[PDB]
Amino acid sequence: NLVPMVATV
Amino acid sequence: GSHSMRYFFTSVSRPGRGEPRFIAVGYVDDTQFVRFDSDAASQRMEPRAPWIEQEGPEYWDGETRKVKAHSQTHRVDLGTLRGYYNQSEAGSHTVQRMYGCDVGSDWRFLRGYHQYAYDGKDYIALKEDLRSWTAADMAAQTTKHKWEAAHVAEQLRAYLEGTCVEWLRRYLENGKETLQRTDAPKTHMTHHAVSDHEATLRCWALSFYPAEITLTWQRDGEDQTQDTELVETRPAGDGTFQKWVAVVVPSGQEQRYTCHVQHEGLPKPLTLRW
Amino acid sequence: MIQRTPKIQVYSRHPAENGKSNFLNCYVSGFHPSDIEVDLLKNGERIEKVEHSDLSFSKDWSFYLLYYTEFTPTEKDEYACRVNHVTLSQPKIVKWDRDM
């Protein structure tokens, strides 16, 4: 199950 | 024994036209269970292990949604990083991300991780405590400040100690017939003569799972590393792994040398002789 | 720009026996960047039906791929893997050695 959100650098 | 769930993501920019090539793969231990490839026709997260096929369309919808979002974040990142590093639009560049969780034999949380690299160099990584960041350079320090302000570590920590562990357990249970089975190495020895005074003994380990293994040589019961060659553990292609270790010995003295094999599928480490 | 040269191993999926269906593998690892050309050769000639694994990478960020094709070993047929990458001035060829 993938992480819900992925922050941009 | 211990278990893990890990996701790996690679984006490679395409300077002249269009979005990056994005490839995402998911693993439980050494078993790939899902993939997404931006060049593939489906544009869905795809199953790669039978036990994940148990999950319903809602799972697939959710994972597809999230993995596309991961791809868009990477696309934006490649542009941002080009700016941070004052690079031109001419060259292709790479971002890589890995995250996931480890559990012990009791399936309780041990460790979490989330790391990022640009053009194969460390960029930024979550520290072991899951509360702070390791930024390799001033560009990554600017990222660290942004992620601190936005409490990114807090969100990740909740996932890594929660959902990640919870879904790892789910997969381990659903896929128990293979995921919870250990395949002990099948071992044998080969012999070669290079001259009339020098021989090579090669100790083989085949068809084992998980990939973790130790192969070593002893001479007269003492550790021997000189004149040995140990190859990288390699995938067989059927879900199992292979490795070998070889030693060079005086012809006629083969009897002094013993190969020792350790693996979670062997209750007792194994010894082989020529 | 970091550039790492691929390591190459060529080998069969199952213990190799003449007349018995098997797979021939070329495992490439430890390379960066990810763009790589890998061919499997039968008697010096490129094999057409070759598949490969999904791109992934190790702790140190280096990439790895498995390329593989169905084959039935015979006494006479020679097999190899031919790899090109930015780090290689010329293609690298590694022969399959079943006696290893």
Side-chain angles (χ1 to χ4, degrees):
Chain A
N1 194 293
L2 292 164
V3 73
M5 230 77 61
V6 185
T8 195
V9 298
Chain B
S2 65
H3 300 281
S4 62
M5 180 167 72
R6 297 169 186 171
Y7 280 103
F8 300 82
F9 309 89
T10 305
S11 296
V12 176
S13 61
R14 282 166 168 185
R17 180 176 74 238
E19 297 161 20
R21 173 63 177 286
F22 169 81
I23 298 166
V25 296
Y27 288 80
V28 169
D29 301 334
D30 297 306
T31 298
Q32 189 196 0
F33 74 103
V34 286
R35 59 98 74 155
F36 182 91
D37 186 337
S38 66
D39 269 7
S42 83
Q43 302 296 304
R44 310 278 296 173
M45 189 70 100
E46 293 178 65
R48 284 293 184 269
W51 48 263
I52 199 69
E53 294 169 16
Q54 294 176 24
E55 302 297 328
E58 349 84 33
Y59 176 86
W60 300 103
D61 288 351
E63 299 304 301
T64 297
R65 172 180 51 84
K66 292 185 284 182
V67 89
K68 289 179 167 169
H70 278 54
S71 178
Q72 292 304 312
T73 294
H74 279 204
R75 173 194 60 79
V76 174
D77 289 352
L78 280 155
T80 301
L81 293 158
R82 196 185 62 74
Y84 284 170
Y85 288 104
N86 298 321
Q87 290 157 335
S88 63
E89 303 202 40
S92 174
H93 299 270
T94 307
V95 292
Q96 287 161 276
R97 184 192 303 269
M98 182 280 284
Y99 62 76
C101 53
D102 294 346
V103 305
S105 295
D106 58 9
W107 297 11
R108 287 169 189 183
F109 177 84
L110 268 182
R111 273 209 268 220
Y113 30 86
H114 179 290
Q115 34 214 241
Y116 206 50
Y118 181 54
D119 289 330
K121 308 176 276 64
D122 293 355
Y123 184 73
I124 194 164
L126 194 60
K127 287 186 191 170
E128 286 213 325
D129 69 0
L130 313 182
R131 289 180 170 272
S132 63
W133 300 96
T134 298
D137 66 10
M138 296 317 293
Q141 182 66 46
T142 282
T143 299
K144 174 168 178 171
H145 288 127
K146 188 183 173 182
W147 290 3
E148 286 177 352
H151 301 276
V152 171
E154 284 85 350
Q155 299 164 10
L156 276 173
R157 177 175 178 243
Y159 165 81
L160 298 166
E161 294 188 346
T163 294
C164 188
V165 178
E166 287 154 14
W167 284 75
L168 176 49
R169 281 193 49 117
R170 180 194 183 108
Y171 297 146
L172 285 175
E173 295 161 349
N174 292 345
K176 71 177 177 294
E177 289 313 306
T178 51
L179 293 183
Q180 293 190 49
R181 192 183 78 208
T182 61
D183 298 354
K186 285 179 173 60
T187 58
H188 73 281
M189 198 173 300
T190 61
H191 183 278
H192 298 287
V194 329
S195 59
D196 59 33
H197 64 96
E198 179 189 322
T200 295
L201 293 175
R202 182 169 291 105
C203 183
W204 278 92
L206 296 174
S207 202
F208 60 89
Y209 183 94
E212 187 50 57
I213 192 161
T214 313
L215 306 180
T216 53
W217 280 106
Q218 285 172 29
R219 189 271 267 191
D220 297 331
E222 300 296 314
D223 289 329
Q224 169 97 42
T225 48
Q226 269 196 301
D227 301 300
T228 71
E229 199 193 337
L230 182 71
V231 293
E232 188 194 341
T233 300
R234 68 204 195 181
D238 65 356
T240 71
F241 298 84
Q242 309 178 348
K243 197 185 192 64
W244 55 255
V245 61
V247 65
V248 178
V249 314
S251 307
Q253 293 309 299
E254 292 90 347
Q255 327 75 41
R256 301 185 182 260
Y257 297 81
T258 52
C259 168
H260 297 85
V261 181
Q262 311 165 253
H263 188 266
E264 31 209 300
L266 299 165
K268 22 88 267 268
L270 179 52
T271 301
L272 288 87
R273 307 161 177 279
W274 180 253
Chain C
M1 189 57 70
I2 64 138
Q3 281 188 356
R4 286 175 255 180
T5 67
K7 300 197 86 66
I8 304 165
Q9 293 189 66
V10 183
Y11 56 100
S12 56
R13 183 183 297 185
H14 298 112
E17 298 184 33
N18 299 332
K20 293 180 197 184
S21 315
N22 210 325
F23 282 82
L24 175 67
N25 292 331
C26 184
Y27 181 58
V28 290
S29 61
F31 62 95
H32 218 287
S34 60
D35 196 8
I36 197 157
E37 195 177 353
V38 181
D39 296 306
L40 297 177
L41 310 177
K42 180 188 184 161
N43 298 315
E45 293 302 297
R46 186 183 163 271
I47 298 170
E48 294 185 58
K49 256 148 62 65
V50 177
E51 289 170 287
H52 63 84
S53 59
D54 296 315
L55 185 73
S56 187
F57 55 86
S58 310
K59 257 264 292 284
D60 72 359
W61 306 114
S62 65
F63 291 106
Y64 64 85
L65 288 164
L66 185 68
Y67 286 72
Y68 58 90
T69 194
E70 307 204 42
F71 82 133
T72 297
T74 68
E75 215 284 335
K76 72 171 174 190
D77 294 315
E78 288 296 312
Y79 290 89
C81 182
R82 182 178 61 206
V83 177
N84 211 346
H85 186 254
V86 64
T87 59
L88 299 170
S89 296
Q90 296 86 26
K92 180 153 161 75
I93 294 173
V94 177
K95 285 168 70 171
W96 180 47
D97 177 1
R98 70 198 294 169
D99 300 318
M100 202 179 305

